[PDB]
Design a protein around this motif. Structure first.
Motif, PDB file in Angstrom:
ATOM      1  N   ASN E   4       0.892  -1.284   0.063  1.00  0.00           N
ATOM      2  CA  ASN E   4      -0.037  -0.223  -0.001  1.00  0.00           C
ATOM      3  C   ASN E   4       1.140   1.252   0.106  1.00  0.00           C
ATOM      4  O   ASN E   4       0.525   2.163  -0.609  1.00  0.00           O
ATOM      5  N   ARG E   7       1.832   1.654  -3.683  1.00  0.00           N
ATOM      6  CA  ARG E   7       0.691   2.078  -4.469  1.00  0.00           C
ATOM      7  C   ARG E   7       0.421   3.557  -4.095  1.00  0.00           C
ATOM      8  O   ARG E   7       0.048   4.379  -4.924  1.00  0.00           O
ATOM      9  N   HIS E  11       0.695   6.718  -6.744  1.00  0.00           N
ATOM     10  CA  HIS E  11      -0.568   7.387  -7.205  1.00  0.00           C
ATOM     11  C   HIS E  11      -0.211   8.819  -6.884  1.00  0.00           C
ATOM     12  O   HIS E  11      -0.647   9.579  -7.808  1.00  0.00           O
ATOM     13  N   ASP E  50      -3.630   1.311 -14.648  1.00  0.00           N
ATOM     14  CA  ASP E  50      -3.855   2.565 -13.873  1.00  0.00           C
ATOM     15  C   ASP E  50      -5.340   2.388 -13.104  1.00  0.00           C
ATOM     16  O   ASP E  50      -6.064   1.839 -13.812  1.00  0.00           O
ATOM     17  N   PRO E  51      -5.266   3.125 -11.886  1.00  0.00           N
ATOM     18  CA  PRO E  51      -6.546   2.555 -11.312  1.00  0.00           C
ATOM     19  C   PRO E  51      -7.632   3.530 -11.845  1.00  0.00           C
ATOM     20  O   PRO E  51      -7.675   4.684 -12.390  1.00  0.00           O
ATOM     21  N   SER E  53     -11.365   5.527 -11.981  1.00  0.00           N
ATOM     22  CA  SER E  53     -11.977   6.670 -11.209  1.00  0.00           C
ATOM     23  C   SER E  53     -13.223   6.963 -11.802  1.00  0.00           C
ATOM     24  O   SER E  53     -13.438   7.152 -12.931  1.00  0.00           O
TER      25      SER E  53
ATOM     26  N   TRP F  41     -12.403   4.965  -6.373  1.00  0.00           N
ATOM     27  CA  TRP F  41     -11.198   4.544  -7.082  1.00  0.00           C
ATOM     28  C   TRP F  41     -11.333   2.861  -6.977  1.00  0.00           C
ATOM     29  O   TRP F  41     -11.804   2.283  -6.284  1.00  0.00           O
ATOM     30  N   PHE F  43      -8.678  -0.339  -7.880  1.00  0.00           N
ATOM     31  CA  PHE F  43      -7.159  -0.828  -8.310  1.00  0.00           C
ATOM     32  C   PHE F  43      -7.037  -2.114  -8.700  1.00  0.00           C
ATOM     33  O   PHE F  43      -8.301  -2.936  -8.724  1.00  0.00           O
ATOM     34  N   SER F  44      -6.133  -3.010  -8.705  1.00  0.00           N
ATOM     35  CA  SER F  44      -5.847  -4.360  -9.226  1.00  0.00           C
ATOM     36  C   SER F  44      -6.450  -5.430  -8.045  1.00  0.00           C
ATOM     37  O   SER F  44      -6.874  -6.624  -8.627  1.00  0.00           O
TER      38      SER F  44
END
Lengths: 48, 50, 48, 317, 53, 52, 36, 317
Positions: E4, E7, E11, E50-51, E53, F41, F43-44
């Motif tokens: 995390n 991550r 980000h 990429d995340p 949103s 959001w 994520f993976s």
């Protein structure tokens, strides 16, 4: 001047398509892609 | 219409295969990822000496 | 002409804000109407 | 730049097949023949704005003028069913007509793609082969049995069942062209789709009995006409394309094949410039147990039909 | 350093801070993003995503 | 331009296969877009968890 | 609808179309089984 | 994705027209209708592996089910001429049949492209117009008279005479569809070829008497079958092309036009999405003296035929 004359109202064209965020339900699909391939050519002509 | 069939029916089999392999890998990865018994220091390495 | 423009502009559920319309602006043989797009469409970044 | 001669072009089959052949882009001369009522068909076809020419001949005496320089000879002649007629009289009449027509073809022009259409084609192709053999001019590479209506019906039923792209659907059909002889190779249907046992049985019986369904749907008004004309025009265009040097003309036909012990069989073949070029044996390799047992069931009756045909074809005059 | 932390460090590098924050108001672009990311993950498993949103 | 109709049919078959595959996994995209709807959001890790 | 809720002319749809066209051009220029 | 319903698809003209419509890549549903023997044609057509679907209806009671959501209505119904029967009784029979069919269409689907093939079309289109007028739903932009047969015959005769490419030759034909009411505009033939005087006379009389030539060549076997089926299929496919938004669909048809003093006339028209879109008047500008006197001679008989048609169409019940 549009108020007391009662015109014939149009439908809403820019209504957004939205999803219920927390309503647990399976929204449906039709069953396809609406796209069609472009393929138009005439048949071969006579005397060949 | 004049266009007959395109790429294959076997390439669809291959892409179905890789789809299923990735789905099964994700399924396996989700539930057996975390299991820990111990990590004890191996500072009695006897095979070097004893 | 501008009456038709105004009538069809005000015949829709969600159109741009009609600020003012003026006949013969500054001696030119024409007319001008002013429409301001709504803030949500500007904040969207895309058109439907 | 090819010529097709239709023998019996004024019957039920004769007019739609002639109409389809006339406005195909491969034929340039169309020599219709029938013993009567062929002038009206020629007058009807001559008004169309297609460059292929139509000429007509009346009576057997003009038969020598009908088959000159003809590249493809099609024989759909034969009287349809009448009430009170058994198989014996109808078979005798149709076989005598096809015998006379094949005699005329052998005498006049034996280097033409011969398309036998008259029913039953299981007992008619051997008759034509025996008649061509008696003149010493028989060519097994240029004698076909038009059994592509079974393929068309199989494709139609498979597409209606599985909801598949009809421009891609093709089903191999082996055996014969009458009843249980029709073995649709439904496991080799392209593109790849999987059927169930009940679906396989239902499709097989529907394909085998579609002929009876379309005969009894008319309530004694005759057999299939528009779909048979469709199949005949398809095979005519395919054979004309084979004459033009096209190297991928694969068609399902009933020809003299060595795939089984039978002298004649219906399978997928590759047609070339000089007639038959290859016979696809892989249609008999990889069959399931249902198709295998259906094949061994139909083999004995197909042998009986071929034996009946060659038995009639050698009757003394 | 947990995953995390990595991550969150990634980000802060591949995202731009913005005042007057607004989101998408007509869903269907979200469906496009969802389908494209799913097809990228299952088919091309040697590329990151990429995340969304 | 005789090469403008082959690519159209190639993309057509690609779209047809993608539609046929997404029909069977409609629930996956449903729960996935709902998860993107609540949690802003995605994520993976959430991706693979929602693949269940 | 009469195509009423389409999202014409925004960010990644044009990029996806361009990438698909480029991949198709690469595949069709390199042909000179896999493909029928 | 368009629907065609044929009323009278079990007659002479109906079966080949239905078959050719089945082969068209624009039709998706074909509705055969006749009072008898219509299930056999549907059974024949359903075996072909074409994506278009064929359904059949028998009896007037199913006619209301025949015309639901139908986009093109085709009416080739009508008994051909029998020996010993004059113009009066056959005219009454054909006009009554077409009157009942047009009543059914007006009750069920007023907004369908109506293609009338029943003969004579000069005295039938006014009857259909009067029947549609009595329901208060008549649309002159969606009522056509199929007179493409004269154009096809003119093209074929010009190609046979002057030896041009049959693919490129087109001859405009004005007037009517019966007797000397047919005027081929041979001076405006594309590609441009100049004729002689006797050649013009011979071509004109051949075009005007091709109908009697083709009904006397059959020796009392009836009228032409394949040629009007060809022309009707061409006109149906052209109408379906115009219905898709194609902006260059120009066809020769017999419609309610204002080019002359006659209420109905046969000329070149442009068809659009909403039916008739334009009527080409330049076909009547620049005519030679021979075509002018032919037009003034044919106008009287065309007016008499239209008068007879509207006189029958308003007879008391």
């Amino acid at each position: 001047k549009m108020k007391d004359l009662s015109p014939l109202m149009f439908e809403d064209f820019v209504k957004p398509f939205q999803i219920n965020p927390d309503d647990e339900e399976l929204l449906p699909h039709k069953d396809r892609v609406s796209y069609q391939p472009v393929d138009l050519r005439a048949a071969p002509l006579h005397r060949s | 219409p004049m266009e007959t069939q395109i790429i294959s029916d076997d390439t669809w089999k291959l892409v179905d295969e890789i789809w299923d392999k990735k789905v099964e890998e994700i399924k396996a990865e989700a539930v057996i990822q975390i299991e820990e018994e111990k990590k004890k220091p191996q500072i009695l390495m006897a095979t070097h000496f004893f | 002409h501008e009456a038709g423009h105004i009538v069809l502009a005000h015949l829709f559920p969600r159109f741009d804000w009609h600020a003012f319309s003026q006949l013969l602006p500054g001696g030119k043989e024409t007319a001008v109407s002013v429409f301001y797009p709504r803030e949500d469409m500007v904040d969207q970044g895309y058109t439907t | 730049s090819y010529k097709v001669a239709v023998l019996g072009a004024a019957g039920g089959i004769g007019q739609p097949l002639s109409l389809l052949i006339k406005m195909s882009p491969l034929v340039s001369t169309l020599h219709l023949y029938d013993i009567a009522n062929v002038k009206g068909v020629a007058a009807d076809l001559s008004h169309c704005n297609t460059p292929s020419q139509v000429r007509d001949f009346t009576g057997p005496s003009e038969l020598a003028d009908c088959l000159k320089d003809v590249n493809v000879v099609v024989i759909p002649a034969g009287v349809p069913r009448k009430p009170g007629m058994t198989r014996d009289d109808l078979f005798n009449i149709n076989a005598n007509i096809v015998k006379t027509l094949v005699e005329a073809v052998a005498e006049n022009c034996p280097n033409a793609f011969i398309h036998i259409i008259s029913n039953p084609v299981n007992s008619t192709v051997p008759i034509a082969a025996e008649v061509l053999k008696k003149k010493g001019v028989y060519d097994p590479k240029k004698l076909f049995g038009v059994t592509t209506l079974d393929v068309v019906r199989a494709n139609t039923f498979v597409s209606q069942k599985k909801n598949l792209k009809l421009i891609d659907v093709d089903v191999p059909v082996i055996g014969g062209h009458a009843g249980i002889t029709i073995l649709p190779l439904l496991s080799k249907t392209k593109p790849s789709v999987n059927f169930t046992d009940e679906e396989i049985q239902e499709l097989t019986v529907r394909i085998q009995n579609a002929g009876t369904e379309v005969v009894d749907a008319k309530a004694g008004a005759g057999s299939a006409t528009l779909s048979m004309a469709y199949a005949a025009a398809r095979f005519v265009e395919s054979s004309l394309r084979a004459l033009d040097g096209d190297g991928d003309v694969y068609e399902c036909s009933f020809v003299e094949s060595t795939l089984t012990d039978l002298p004649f069989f219906a399978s997928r073949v590759k047609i070339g410039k000089n007639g038959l070029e290859a016979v696809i044996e892989s249609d008999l390799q990889g069959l399931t147990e249902y198709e295998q047992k259906a094949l061994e069931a139909l083999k004995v009756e197909l042998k009986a039909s071929i034996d009946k045909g060659v038995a009639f074809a050698n009757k003394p005059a | 350093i947990d995953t995390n932390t990595i991550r969150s460090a990634l980000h802060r590098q591949t995202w731009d801070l913005r005042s007057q924050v607004r989101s998408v108001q007509d869903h269907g672009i979200l469906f496009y993003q969802i389908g494209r990311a799913v097809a990228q993950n299952v088919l091309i498993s040697n590329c990151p995503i990429d995340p969304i949103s | 331009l005789s090469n403008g109709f082959f690519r159209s049919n190639t993309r057509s078959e690609s779209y047809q296969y993608l539609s046929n595959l997404f029909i069977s996994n409609g629930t996956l995209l449903d729960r996935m877009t709902k998860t993107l709807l609540k949690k802003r959001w995605l994520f993976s890790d959430e991706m693979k968890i929602g693949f269940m | 609808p009469d195509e009423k809720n389409r999202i014409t002319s925004y960010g990644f749809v044009e990029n996806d179309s361009d990438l698909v066209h480029g991949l198709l051009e690469v595949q069709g220029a390199l042909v000179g089984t896999l493909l029928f």
